[PDB]
Structures are given as structure tokens and as C-alpha cells.
């Protein structure tokens, strides 16, 4: 009786995407420390989910020593930026330029690690059983991308989307292929996730068409 | 020869949704009394429909005493706010703070009552016979949501949609998935009903696709 | 070897719709006489098509005296406003108020006549043979509505669409369900024809879906 | 082992469309010489592809003397404007008005030549084997039109789209039938290619619907 429901690997893919989101977060412009470390808070939240999923990777014991070793390949993902940047500030208090460059290379390594973890999660999700389950899965991906746009922009200045729930607004707008126009990312990676959510609303529409053909052949009954 | 046509339970669902609309209406910002009591007028109009539907619930006689008793559960819905707020003003003339709080709790109870009545109407509509009847039913829901947006915004200030028929305009815009952009709720619950009308235009599109497959298999003939 | 191609009754429906357009034209605000009589020119153009179609109604001879009599019911349609308003100005030079009111009633009668002629043309088009012919017919209706929006707005002031080809632009925008937003009628009957073109682009989309199912069952081959 | 993959004739159609694009480029307003000759650079790039494709037309030898002769009909396409306009400037240094008119007629001839080459490439693409290959082909046409809008506007002033990747942005917007509204050609031939990309996103949607029916009949399995 553990986390193995379809919704489980759903949340798995979700957390992987969110780790990619944190990756995006790490490199950024010069930002306000308050919302910066707020993002850090959300990132530590996600590292908790990292703990959970990588725990489920093993059987909660160390006897899978081989996967433990492969976990070492992907434990850089589990490494938290909240701690990394703080130790960075400590070193700055010490005065270690080359060590700061070393930590930057470490940041890039963690980046690539979380990206590969994303690859893994997306593959396993692609190997899910029920394509009827897509009914939920799509909406799930949708609200996810909503949260993700929120992440990237809610602290981002001059976005005009600084309020929260409006994330859901513009999101469903997109998923519904509206384009009300008063709200849009207007930032490069914002528009990247825009590509994401656009193909997403596409897929949603497609699922709707599939449900249409379903209801057709069934109103035949 | 009574009200039992499919259009009847249609108007039933319609009135239930509109009661939810009035519920929304009750709590609001500080508003102009004129349009406020205009909303009250429309609400009394709807209470007339409440009278009609709850009359049809019984056989116009009191022998269904059990449903009469269950009507007592849902007669708070039939209670009019036009009268409630006026008796509230009377009590204010009297100076009864705690009694005003009591009437506020009464308002919340009426809220929940009308919500449950909505639940009932939506279930019974979900148990309707002809899914071909959806052809009309969708357009009906559409023009309804049009009227509802009108309700929430036509008196609402700075909406830029203060004119009437423009309700129909933005509505069909949505149902047609246009998003002309010059017109949008820009209010929280306005955007909520926006979610509503958006999934609604979605459903409309879906019905259109179903008609497409129909016309396809029939041009095969 | 006369005008009996499907494209013929196509242009028939087209001219009927355009007569309705002229009807719209007649009543209007106080307008610039130049573009006013330019509309009059286009209207006389259409009355030529009225001559053509009502000629085709008979066999170019008067032996169909009964349809000649029924043509008298619908010859008010053939009556030109270019001549009517000019005789109106003549009477104004004479000073005949009540006769001007009489001519206004005459205008209303011509209105209703052209409306019924529209009814006839639309019925006969509804009785067309090939629903494959819809492939063209839809695009035809589309470019028509384009021209019609042009009619109503190109002279209409402050529309921001005073340029010509932009009619085609906003039209295809609609038919493609774009809503670029920089261009919109912003006038009551403009938005009416907007409803028209919106359901039109809907129908276009539907035809596209039908072609989709066609190409599907044929790529099966 | 030569260029004969489906992607090959894909790039063929692509280069033909781009030659049409250069044709558009040639006649234009008075423009900044820097971006002007930048367009010239891209055009010489395309003339290299002209060399490649017309080489593949023969077997890299002159024994197909007949097609060599027909290549003479279409070698004006291979003629570069980068060289033509430069020789034009040389003649201007000489003072040869009538010869400049002659070169203008030559420009028109090259125009028509590249147009016919486009006709040829589009026909041969229409005779492609796999309509499953459309899955890629559509996206390919899409990103092409993206690049093309970029060509026509990125140097074009006051477009508000002077930045590069935003080409991809507005493109996918269109292909996804969004219309975010902050970005649009607002130029005549810009809107022409807009028609192009609009019917293109239409076709994309249609392909998506086909994939929908596919996934439907396969989830039946």
C-alpha cells in the first residue's frame, strides 16, 4: 500500500518538470532577495519530493546498492540550491573566487542531473498503461504549466501578472486557445513555456476531439 | 398538459444557475443602490420561478407532506433577498446588531440552500433523455451565461461592458473562441464565469464536431 | 446554355444577401453624401443583378403571367434606391411632407420585399444538389461576408478599417478564428454581421473537419 | 547515396518558397543599405541551394543537354541579385538609364522564372509518396513561414517585431491559432504571408484531428 497509483507517477512527472523549473530559476537576472529566497523555499519543497521519489526508487533499504550507485549519479538533483547558494555566500565571506567558480560548475552539473531525471520521469510516464487516464493527465499537465508560469513570472517584475490566480487565468486562456491579449509572458523563457502550454492546449483540444468521437459512436447506441 | 417539455427542465437548470447568480450577487462591494435594487428586482423575478418550480415539485397539493417537509429544507432558497435586506434595514432602524449577524448567518444558509437546489437541478438535467437535444441545450446554456455575465457586470463599475447587448457580443465571442480582446471581465468572479463560458464554448465546439461526423456519415448517403 | 451552373445559384444567394446589405444601408446615420451615393452606385449594380435573376425567373417572355404577377409582389425589390431617394429630393424641392412619409413607407415595403426575396434565394440554395459543392460554397460565403463588412464599414467613420483590402484581412481572420484584435466592427450591426461571419468561420472549420475525416478514410487506402 | 530522402524534396520546396521570398524582397521601399545587403547575403545563400538543386536536376554531367536547355529557361532563377544590383550600381556610375530599365525588365524576368520554379517544386512535392510524412512536412512548412515572416519584417521598420526569435513566437502563435495580438505584420505582403500561415495553422490543426482519429481507432486496440 505505497505510492503506485497512476496519480503517483503523475506527480512524479510533475515534480520532474518542477525541478526543471527550479533549474530555470537558478540562473536569472539580478532579483529581489525576498522573492528570490521565496523561490528557494518552493525549491526546498520540491527537494522534499525528490527525497520521496528517490526513496521510492529503492525499496526503502540499501540492499539495492547498484541503484544506490546510480542514485549517486542523480543525487546532485537532490542537492538543494537553498543550501548551495547559502554556502556560496559563506565562501564569499571567506573570499574564495576560484571556489565560487567551482560551485558554479557544480550548479551546471546539478542542472544536467535534474534534466536527465526529467528525461527518466518523462520516459516512464510515456510507458504508462491507460491512455484513457489521459483525460485527467492532460488537465494535470495544464494546471502544472499554470503553476510553472506562476513560478517564473509572479516574482518577475513588470510582467503585469504579479497576482497569483491570474496564472490560472492566462493558463486556461491558453489551454482554451483564447488569447485574451491583456496577459502574456513577454519574456524569452516565459514565451518558451508559452510554446509548452500552447502545444499543451493543442493536445487538450485533441483529447476533446477524441471524446467527441467517443460520444458519437456511443450516441449511436 | 403541464410544464414537462425538455425545454421545461432546461429552464429549470437555467433558474437554478440564476439562483446561484443571485447568491453571488448578494455579497458584493459597496454598490450604487439603484442598480443594487435593480438586481433585487431580477432576483424577485427569479423567486417567482422558484415558486413555479417548487410548485411543480409537488402535485399542486399538500398531500406530498414528506416533500413539503423536504421543501422546508429548500424553502430558504424561495426566501427573497429583496425582502430580507429590507427587513434588515428595518432592524437597522431599530438598532439590533446581533440580530443583523443572525440575518447574515441566515443569508449564508439561504446561499447553501440555493447551491444544493442547483445540485439537484443539475443532476436531474444530467438525467435527461435525448442527447440530440443537446443541440439546443448548449446554445441555451450559452445565452444563459451571457445573461449571467450581464448580471454580474452591467452594474459593476469600470468594467467597460456597461452596455447591455455587448453581453451577447462577448458571450458569442467566447463561445466562438474568438477573444477580440477589447472586452473581458477583469474581475475575479467575472473570470470565474469566464472559466464557465470557456469550457462552455469548448463543449459547443465539441457538439459542432459531433454534428460534423454526423453530416459526414450522412453525406456518405 | 444559360446561367444554371451551381455557381449561378451561388451568385443568386450572394445577390440576395447583398440586397439585404443594401436594405441595411438605406437607413443609417447622417453620412457624407459622396460615400453615400457611392453605396447607391453599388446598389444600382445590385439592381442590375436583380434584373438578371428575375429575368431568369421567367423564360425571358411574358407568357408566365402568373409569375409576372408574383413578380409584382417582389418587383419592389427591383426598385432602385438611387432613383427613389433622388425623386425624394425632387419632392423636397416641391415641399411634400406627407408624400415623403409615403415614400418612407414605400422604403419599408421594399425592405420587406427584398427580405422575402432573400428567404426565397436561401431556401432554393438549401435545396442545392451537391454537398461536396460546399467546399467552394463556404469560401464563397466567406468572401461575400468580407465584401459585406466592407460595405457597411469602409464609408462608416472612425471604424479604423477605412482601407479596402483589410476587409479581406479581418474577414479571413474571423473565418480562421484568429481575432488579431487590432480590427473589429465596434458597431451594432457591424457586430451583427460579426455574428454572421463567426458562425461562418465555424462552418468553415466544420467543413475542414469533414475533409479531415475524408482524407483519413482515404489514407486508409 | 545522394540527396533523395523525403527531407530532400522537403528542403527543395523550402528553397523554392524562399526564392519567392527573395523575389518579394527585391522590389521594396527605400531601405537601409545594411539590412538590404544582409537580405542580399541570405539571397546568395539561397542561390547556393539553387546551384545544388539544379545540379541534382541533371546527373552532374552535361549529357542531359535537353534539360540543360530547359535549365536555360530557369537559369535566370540561379542569377543572383547580389551581383545584379551591384552591376546596376556600376552602370549607374556609367550613366546608362535605358540599360537600367533593361536590367529592371531582367529583374521581372528572373521574378517570373523563380515563380515557375516554385510551381515545379510545389507540383513535385504534391507528388510525394507518404502522406504520413505530412506529420513532419507540416511543421517544416510552419517553421519555414516563420523564417519567411522574419525575412520580410526583421529589417522592415516600425514592425515592432525587429527581434529574431519572436518570429518563431508569432509563428507558433498563428499555427496554434492564438492571436496574442501584441504582434502582427501590419503590412500588406506581411498580411499576405499571414494568409499563408493562417491556412497553414489550419492544415496543422487538420493533421492533428487526423492523428486524433488515428489514436482513437488505435485505443480501440
Numbering used by the authors:
A (entry chain A), B (entry chain B), C (entry chain D), D (entry chain C): 20 to 240
From the manuscript:
The final density map, calculated to 6 Å resolution, showed continuous density for the transmembrane region, density for the Fabs on the extracellular side and a poorly resolved cytoplasmic domain (CTD) on the intracellular side. An important first conclusion is that KvAP is a non-domain-swapped voltage-gated ion channel, meaning each voltage sensor is contiguous with the pore element from the same polypeptide chain. That this must be the case is evident in the short turn connecting S4 to S5 instead of a long α-helical S4-S5 linker. In contrast, S1 in KvAP runs parallel to and in contact with S5 throughout its length inside the membrane. However, because of the unique interaction between S1 and S5, the S3b-S4 paddle in KvAP resides on the outer-most perimeter of the channel, oriented tangent to the pore domain. In the structure, the helical turn of S3b into S4, the Fab epitope, is exposed to the extracellular surface, compatible with Fab accessibility and a depolarized conformation of KvAP. The conformation of the inner helix gate in this structure might reflect a mixture of open and inactivated channels.
KvAP is a Kv channel from the thermophilic archaea Aeropyrum pernix. All voltage sensors have a shared structure consisting of four helical transmembrane segments. The fourth helix, termed S4, contains positive-charged amino acids that move within the transmembrane electrical field as part of a global conformational change. Each subunit encodes a voltage sensor from transmembrane helices S1-S4 and one fourth of the pore from S5 and S6.
